[PDB]
Design a protein around this nucleic acid. Structure first.
Ligand SMILES: [Mg+2]
Ligand SMILES: [Mg+2]
Ligand SMILES: [Mg+2]
Ligand SMILES: [Mg+2]
Ligand SMILES: [Mg+2]
Ligand SMILES: [Mg+2]
Ligand SMILES: [Mg+2]
Ligand SMILES: [Mg+2]
Ligand SMILES: [Mg+2]
Ligand SMILES: [Mg+2]
Ligand SMILES: [Mg+2]
Ligand SMILES: [Mg+2]
Ligand SMILES: [Mg+2]
Ligand SMILES: [Mg+2]
Ligand SMILES: [Mg+2]
Ligand SMILES: [Mg+2]
Ligand SMILES: [Mg+2]
Ligand SMILES: [Mg+2]
Ligand SMILES: [Mg+2]
Ligand SMILES: [Mg+2]
Ligand SMILES: [Mg+2]
Ligand SMILES: [Mg+2]
Ligand SMILES: [Mg+2]
Ligand SMILES: [Mg+2]
Ligand SMILES: [Mg+2]
Ligand SMILES: [Mg+2]
Ligand SMILES: [Mg+2]
Ligand SMILES: [Mg+2]
Ligand SMILES: [Mg+2]
Ligand SMILES: [Mg+2]
Ligand SMILES: [Mg+2]
Ligand SMILES: [Mg+2]
Ligand SMILES: [Mg+2]
Ligand SMILES: [Mg+2]
Ligand SMILES: [Mg+2]
Ligand SMILES: [Mg+2]
Ligand SMILES: [Mg+2]
Ligand SMILES: [Mg+2]
Ligand SMILES: [Mg+2]
Ligand SMILES: [Mg+2]
Ligand SMILES: [Mg+2]
Ligand SMILES: [Mg+2]
Ligand SMILES: [Mg+2]
Ligand SMILES: [Mg+2]
Ligand SMILES: [Mg+2]
Ligand SMILES: [Mg+2]
Ligand SMILES: [Mg+2]
Ligand SMILES: [Mg+2]
Ligand SMILES: [Mg+2]
Ligand SMILES: [Mg+2]
Ligand SMILES: [Mg+2]
Ligand SMILES: [Mg+2]
Ligand SMILES: [Mg+2]
Ligand SMILES: [Mg+2]
Ligand SMILES: [Mg+2]
Ligand SMILES: [Mg+2]
Ligand SMILES: [Mg+2]
Ligand SMILES: [Mg+2]
Ligand SMILES: [Mg+2]
Ligand SMILES: [Mg+2]
Ligand SMILES: [Mg+2]
Ligand SMILES: [Mg+2]
Ligand SMILES: [Mg+2]
Ligand SMILES: [Mg+2]
Ligand SMILES: [Mg+2]
Ligand SMILES: [Mg+2]
Ligand SMILES: [Mg+2]
Ligand SMILES: [Mg+2]
Ligand SMILES: [Mg+2]
Ligand SMILES: [Mg+2]
Ligand SMILES: [Mg+2]
Ligand SMILES: [Mg+2]
Ligand SMILES: [Mg+2]
Ligand SMILES: [Mg+2]
Ligand SMILES: [Mg+2]
Ligand SMILES: [Mg+2]
Ligand SMILES: [Mg+2]
Ligand SMILES: [Mg+2]
Ligand SMILES: [Mg+2]
Ligand SMILES: [Mg+2]
Ligand SMILES: [Mg+2]
Ligand SMILES: [Mg+2]
Ligand SMILES: [Mg+2]
Ligand SMILES: [Mg+2]
Ligand SMILES: [Mg+2]
Ligand SMILES: [Mg+2]
Lengths: 175, 76, 45, 141, 59, 111
RNA sequence: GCGCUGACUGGGGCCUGUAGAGCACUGAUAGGGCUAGGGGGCCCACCAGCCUACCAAACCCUGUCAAACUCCGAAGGGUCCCAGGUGGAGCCUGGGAGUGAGGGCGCGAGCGAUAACGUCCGCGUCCGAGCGCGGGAACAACCGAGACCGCCAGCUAAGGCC
RNA sequence: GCGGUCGCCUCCUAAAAGGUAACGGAGGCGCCCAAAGGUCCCCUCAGGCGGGACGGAAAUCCGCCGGAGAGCGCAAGGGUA
RNA sequence: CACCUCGAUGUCGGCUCGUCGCAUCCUGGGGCUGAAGAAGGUCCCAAGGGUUGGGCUGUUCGCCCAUUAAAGCGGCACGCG
RNA sequence: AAUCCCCCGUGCCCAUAGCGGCGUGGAACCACCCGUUCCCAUUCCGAACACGGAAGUGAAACGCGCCAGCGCCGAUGGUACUGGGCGGGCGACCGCCUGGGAGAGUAGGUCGGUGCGGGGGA
């Protein structure tokens, strides 16, 4: 649930060079501040595979600090589908917006053995308090039924806060 | 082949740019619709052609929603 | 229908053009002569 | 095979292939994918042979995606003729594919299975390819 | 801060507007040096032929 | 419902006026009163004001108009101003709008 | 004859809709969802009528494509102004012409087969007329370099140094 | 040779000024209108939903929503409430 | 395609004389066989030599008769006036 | 006249000023309103336009506020592309140097700003 990164500071130095030196460029920003940094590619990869804009990265970084950051965009060059720039979003005391995984729980969900699990969104956009950050979200109902649909307001929704628009959407069905 | 046709290039466009000195008569823009609208001291003929109404210099104005304008600000 | 309409003395013949079989009447309208000024002007030949 | 019905214009130039995959580009439907390493015109009849090869090696279930589509009209004279007098004539359709693009991509199958299918499917293509899984990065939206 | 420009690579096969610059400077022959007033305009042509010239700073 | 016969007709007549180059004798009339304003565009500036709600007069608003009509002349003509165009905005050239214009006599005019 | 106006360059204004990208229009388009009506399969044959294992409008997501699509839009290019720029520069009037069969290469497109020492344009360059000199084994146009004459002097370019 | 073409307009090709070729990709003109002309005054579309005898997808009407996707005699483009 | 040749580079087939390639028709040597043997199939090595006589047609080619270890395919200005 | 608040005019910027929800304002302005004699009117209608009035109302409209659901605006980094200069691959194409540098998207921002002139206030 807790991922450590590291970091450094950028001002000059062409990203081309950093790139060459195993380091991965990137910026750090939010309502209050904005500064350019660079992580270690080999390191960052290890973290992001598991992290993945779903969980929080604390970002060490000289300055001795440890900043609460979500990753809000990853630019990867298409030719080799490897990353080439990460930008980290730092959390403060004010509800944010993010993506939360969807633990497809329950069973074949009604009419079991069998039916259609119908996987739509392994994530979901939610406006939530930076303090309480759901590790995931239980998606069960029971279940379930045949040719039904768990909209969105039917879902669990832990004591985070709420949804992010889209009151009515798929997420569930059997056909 | 059923194709092969085309028409003579009509050499359309702006004839005087901003900060160019013109004279009553000088046509300033050749265009189809009203891509530019006649501003200060700027007439426009039946083929939508903009020309200086007086002598002076040329200035352009982008009135956003109101379109773009060619003015001939005097000096005469 | 090529048309050449005239005045009402010393001729004139300031020619115009009425295309069809309507207008098909005398096809006349008030016009201006090179001589005096503004007279009737009728249609012929 | 696979052509786009109703077209504003039949016969279109050819343009170049200097691009680098508009995108794309990051997998977005299945568990695994086939990515284009080289630029090429992929023919509807090449796509159909790649699709079939998979649905076939998948017993019949299966769940392709393709993601590339032949909307470009490919012309060609009637051979035995000389230049001039009209253009090509249209003898099929192609899809334009620069590196990066994700073609096909499958889901709902094992790994040692999906990966064997994508390999087969890849042999039907005139370019070099690459098999992928799909990690966070892919979740670029 | 006068500049010392010196033609070191032949413009045989370069655009005509580049042969024009080498002229605007006054460079007519290879190895020829010319010391000119370091101004923006005079620098324009010096950096245009930057691949054919070798520049030094002088008194 | 974007823009209205009012707003439209307003621009239409007022746009034409602003082309001719002259100073604008803009006329706003309300249910109770009628006001008049001589504006210079390109300078975005008013020169001579003349209301009825500013001259605290009343009694038959077609006759009041003409008064604020003649009132505009006097004040204005004394500033050099003689020739002008005359807005009219949304109002048909009639009644108290026509009246004020007819009052604008004793001052440049041509209207 | 006029004579600093020239190419090129610096600064400044204005013009543009390509490269790239985009999907807001015109169309194309993968999957899923929800639903006009039909395929239907059918109950009736009086309303009807239930279901969607083929469609499939719109609408919503997730994905994409386009010379004759563009909500966007660089670099560049054009033009005017003010400066630098004296050059086999510029401009004006006139005498004499020759040329009006081009070709290779690079870059950008069309045609062609993402064929041709192919073909047709664009911007550049060289050969043409530099079949003079060095390199590339030899070789008009690739690299180097513009040959006034002489030297049994020197430094270099490309390319090389068993 | 046979075939096709030959002037004019629109679009692309055309590489963001102008211009630019090919038996390159596609369309159109050889008219028309005494009102479809001038001026002054007014008026604002297309669609979508709901409502309403004969009215049906669509005749005329009422309501709300509708920045232009309508219209501008005919091609295309630009333009335009 | 139109690059040398139109102040001339004689054009099919046959005959004659060859020579070369090997993607081998036979003969030599091999591996595999759904190779019992004999006889085949298929692939590998191998160009030393060999590779028939007739009917038809200008024919090349091809069909056919009789044979054969086999009746090989190509290049040489579709080799050679 | 100074400063300021509200309101009526009229400009300019041309969506950060817009849609929508909610809340406010009638002393004054404005609107609606009250009438259709008169000017003048509606291819029918005093709806509009127009006149004469003012009892009534801020319901509609308009003005002023608040709300970021939509609309609009939108960096910073990083890329794409590309002047100019160099390389590489049979090609289709790719890379380096030096200058310029988007589009999408992210963080955000916004439910206006201001000129002149009036009327009323302090
Ligand atoms: Mg042509
Ligand atoms: Mg044209
Ligand atoms: Mg602009
Ligand atoms: Mg005449
Ligand atoms: Mg994308
Ligand atoms: Mg050279
Ligand atoms: Mg000078
Ligand atoms: Mg110049
Ligand atoms: Mg300049
Ligand atoms: Mg634009
Ligand atoms: Mg493009
Ligand atoms: Mg679209
Ligand atoms: Mg569509
Ligand atoms: Mg679909
Ligand atoms: Mg384009
Ligand atoms: Mg266009
Ligand atoms: Mg923008
Ligand atoms: Mg320039
Ligand atoms: Mg400039
Ligand atoms: Mg000068
Ligand atoms: Mg000369
Ligand atoms: Mg001369
Ligand atoms: Mg002469
Ligand atoms: Mg000729
Ligand atoms: Mg010629
Ligand atoms: Mg040529
Ligand atoms: Mg040439
Ligand atoms: Mg050339
Ligand atoms: Mg050569
Ligand atoms: Mg190159
Ligand atoms: Mg070539
Ligand atoms: Mg050639
Ligand atoms: Mg070159
Ligand atoms: Mg010659
Ligand atoms: Mg040479
Ligand atoms: Mg030369
Ligand atoms: Mg030679
Ligand atoms: Mg030589
Ligand atoms: Mg040599
Ligand atoms: Mg040589
Ligand atoms: Mg010399
Ligand atoms: Mg010498
Ligand atoms: Mg030495
Ligand atoms: Mg060296
Ligand atoms: Mg050597
Ligand atoms: Mg013929
Ligand atoms: Mg152009
Ligand atoms: Mg309607
Ligand atoms: Mg209806
Ligand atoms: Mg109805
Ligand atoms: Mg239109
Ligand atoms: Mg039209
Ligand atoms: Mg149009
Ligand atoms: Mg239009
Ligand atoms: Mg020839
Ligand atoms: Mg030729
Ligand atoms: Mg001879
Ligand atoms: Mg001979
Ligand atoms: Mg074999
Ligand atoms: Mg053998
Ligand atoms: Mg045996
Ligand atoms: Mg054997
Ligand atoms: Mg062999
Ligand atoms: Mg015979
Ligand atoms: Mg034989
Ligand atoms: Mg035969
Ligand atoms: Mg025989
Ligand atoms: Mg032989
Ligand atoms: Mg032959
Ligand atoms: Mg022969
Ligand atoms: Mg003979
Ligand atoms: Mg012979
Ligand atoms: Mg106001
Ligand atoms: Mg806008
Ligand atoms: Mg509102
Ligand atoms: Mg209230
Ligand atoms: Mg309100
Ligand atoms: Mg009260
Ligand atoms: Mg009261
Ligand atoms: Mg209210
Ligand atoms: Mg109000
Ligand atoms: Mg943006
Ligand atoms: Mg940037
Ligand atoms: Mg941006
Ligand atoms: Mg706010
Ligand atoms: Mg005041």
């Amino acid at each position: 649930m807790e991922y450590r990164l590291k970091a450094y500071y950028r001002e000059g130095e062409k990203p081309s060079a950093l790139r060459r030196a195993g380091k991965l460029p990137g910026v750090m920003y939010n309502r209050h501040l904005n500064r350019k940094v660079y992580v270690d590619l080999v390191e960052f990869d290890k973290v992001f595979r598991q992290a993945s804009i779903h969980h929080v990265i604390v970002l060490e970084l000289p300055d001795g600090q440890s900043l609460p950051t979500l990753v809000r965009q990853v630019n990867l060059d298409k030719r080799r589908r490897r990353p080439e720039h990460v930008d980290f979003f730092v959390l403060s005391d004010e509800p944010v917006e993010m993506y939360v995984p969807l633990r497809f729980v329950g069973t074949p969900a009604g009419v079991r053995a069998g039916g259609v699990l119908q996987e739509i969104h392994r994530d979901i956009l939610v406006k939530v308090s930076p303090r309480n950050i759901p590790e995931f979200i239980e998606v069960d109902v029971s279940g379930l039924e045949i040719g039904d649909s768990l909209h969105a307001s039917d879902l669990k929704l832990p004591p985070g806060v709420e949804l992010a628009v889209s009151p009515e959407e798929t997420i569930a069905a059997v056909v | 082949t059923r194709n092969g046709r085309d028409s003579q290039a009509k050499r359309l466009g702006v004839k005087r740019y901003e900060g160019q000195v013109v004279r009553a008569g000088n046509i300033l823009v050749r265009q189809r619709g009203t891509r530019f609208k006649p501003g200060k001291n700027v007439g426009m003929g039946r083929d939508f052609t903009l020309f200086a109404l007086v002598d002076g210099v040329v200035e352009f104005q982008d009135r956003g929603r109101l379109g773009r304008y060619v003015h001939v600000r005097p000096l005469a | 229908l090529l048309l050449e309409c005239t005045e009402c003395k010393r001729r004139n013949y300031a020619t115009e053009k009425n295309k069809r079989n309507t207008p098909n009447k005398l096809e006349l309208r008030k016009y201006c002569p090179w001589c005096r000024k503004h007279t009737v002007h009728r249609e012929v030949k | 095979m696979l052509m786009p019905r109703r077209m504003k214009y039949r016969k279109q130039q050819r343009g170049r292939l200097k691009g680098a995959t508009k995108g794309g580009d990051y997998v977005a439907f299945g568990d695994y994918g086939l990515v284009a390493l080289e630029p090429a015109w992929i023919t509807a009849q090449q796509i159909e042979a790649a699709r079939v090869a998979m649905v076939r090696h998948f017993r019949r279930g299966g769940k392709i995606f393709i993601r590339i589509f032949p909307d470009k009209p490919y012309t060609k004279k009637p051979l035995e003729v000389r230049m001039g007098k009209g253009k090509g004539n249209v003898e099929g359709y192609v899809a334009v594919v620069k590196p990066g693009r994700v073609m096909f991509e499958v889901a709902g199958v094992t790994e040692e299975q999906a990966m064997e299918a994508l390999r087969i499917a890849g042999h039907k293509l005139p370019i070099k390819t690459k098999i992928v899984r799909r990690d966070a990065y892919d979740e670029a939206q | 801060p006068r500049l010392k420009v010196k033609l070191v690579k032949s413009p045989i096969g370069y655009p005509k507007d580049q042969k024009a610059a080498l002229k605007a400077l006054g460079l007519r022959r290879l190895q020829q040096e010319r010391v000119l007033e370091d101004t923006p305009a005079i620098r324009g042509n010096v950096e245009k032929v930057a691949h054919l010239v070798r520049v030094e700073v002088v008194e | 419902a974007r823009l209205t016969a009012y707003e439209r007709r307003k621009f239409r007549v007022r746009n034409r006026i602003k082309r001719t180059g002259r100073l604008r004798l803009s006329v706003f009339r309300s249910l109770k009163h009628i006001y008049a304003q001589i504006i210079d565009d390109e300078k975005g500036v008013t020169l001579v004001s003349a209301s009825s709600l500013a001259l605290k007069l009343k009694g038959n608003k077609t006759e009041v108009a003409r008064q604020v009509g003649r009132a505009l002349a006097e004040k204005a003509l004394a500033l050099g101003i003689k020739q002008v165009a005359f807005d009219r905005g949304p109002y048909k050239y009639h009644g108290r709008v026509k009246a004020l214009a007819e009052g604008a006599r004793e001052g440049g005019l041509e209207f």
